[PDB]
């Protein structure tokens, strides 16, 4: 499979401790595999890659000149920090106010693939809706990917309900990711313009 459209794709990796360092690499691997099925280019598909905890570590920005192999290289080496916490609502505010602070590609779609393997406290999840709705008003689709048990099922549901495009994918763990690519990739490609 191969996707070549007008996409702003943002990978958000649940870099908490709810994933063993070794499991993290399986996460990273999945991210790199979807990239080989993407026509990464400033005029086609642009990708940003952020590892979030209570804060956000951005290893890749949409606007970049490095070669896609150079880009796939930078993500496969994304250092492990197994953070104590990994707030989903918070990394969505980052995406809302930073990555897409401005929309220089109005003719293109904007997708944030949130790969989450943990659950944040309601004190915080109380923001989940407004940030997901804010990203909606900016024409930014959020696709939650539940990796495993520790992924807040109700919090994932919150992110969905916000819009029909916001589909979800529930996985038993990181291994299952390895086989979900085709699906996610292709689903995610059918929402973007062309030419």
């Amino acid at each position: 499979f191969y996707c070549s459209k007008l996409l702003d794709l943002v990978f958000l990796l649940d870099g908490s401790s709810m994933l063993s360092e070794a499991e993290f690499e399986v996460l990273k691997a999945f991210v790199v595999g979807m990239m080989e099925r993407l026509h990464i280019s400033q005029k086609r598909i642009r990708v940003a890659v952020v590892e979030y905890h209570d804060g956000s570590r951005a290893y890749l920005e949409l606007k970049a000149r490095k070669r896609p192999s150079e880009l796939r290289r930078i993500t496969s080496q994304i250092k492990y920090t197994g953070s104590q916490v990994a707030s989903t609502s918070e990394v969505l505010k980052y995406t809302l106010f930073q990555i897409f602070g401005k929309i220089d590609r109005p003719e293109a779609s904007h997708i944030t693939l949130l790969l989450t393997a943990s659950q944040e406290p309601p004190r915080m999840a109380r923001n989940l809706v407004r940030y997901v709705q804010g990203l909606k008003k900016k024409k930014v689709i959020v696709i939650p990917v539940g990796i495993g048990p520790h992924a807040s099922l109700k919090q994932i549901r919150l992110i969905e309900k916000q819009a029909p495009e916001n589909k979800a994918f529930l996985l038993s763990g990181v291994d299952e990711l390895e086989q979900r690519r085709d699906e996610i990739v292709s689903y995610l490609c059918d929402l973007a313009p062309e030419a």
Binding site: P121, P122, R123, A125, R126, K154, R157, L158
Partner: protein, 125 residues
């Protein structure tokens, strides 16, 4: 017998912490002191008054976190038009507020749990 820095009362132990965290950190902090500990809970007024003497070195008009959280999402709702709805669709409908006490007049304040307050822990064994 209560550990050092703890004052006993009708079987329990209490302690005023001058830490400044939110309800969650508050509750969790307590549990990680002495097994079975939690934020303070007031059964009778006497208990309250007893916890009041521990909270004297604090300002006039402040509030301490007590053992009650998310008091609006535990409620049961309903619309005036009697519309139907499945509680699972109302996950974080209300605010996430918790209870804080004002030792002086022992008045409970229902405020947002994200606020930094001083607190009181409790346990009996």
């Amino acid at each position: 017998d209560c550990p050092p820095d703890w004052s006993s009362y009708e079987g329990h132990c209490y302690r005023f912490f001058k830490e400044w965290m939110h309800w969650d950190d508050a509750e969790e902090f307590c549990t990680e002191q002495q097994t079975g500990a939690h934020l303070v809970s007031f059964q009778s007024k006497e208990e309250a008054d007893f916890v009041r003497s521990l909270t004297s070195e604090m300002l006039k008009g402040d509030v301490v976190w007590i053992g009650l959280s998310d008091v609006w999402n535990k409620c049961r709702f309903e619309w005036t038009d009697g519309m139907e709805f499945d509680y699972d669709d109302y996950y974080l409908i209300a605010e996430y507020e918790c209870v804080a006490s004002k030792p002086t007049n022992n008045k409970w304040w229902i405020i947002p749990c994200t606020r930094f307050k001083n607190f009181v822990c409790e346990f009996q064994a």
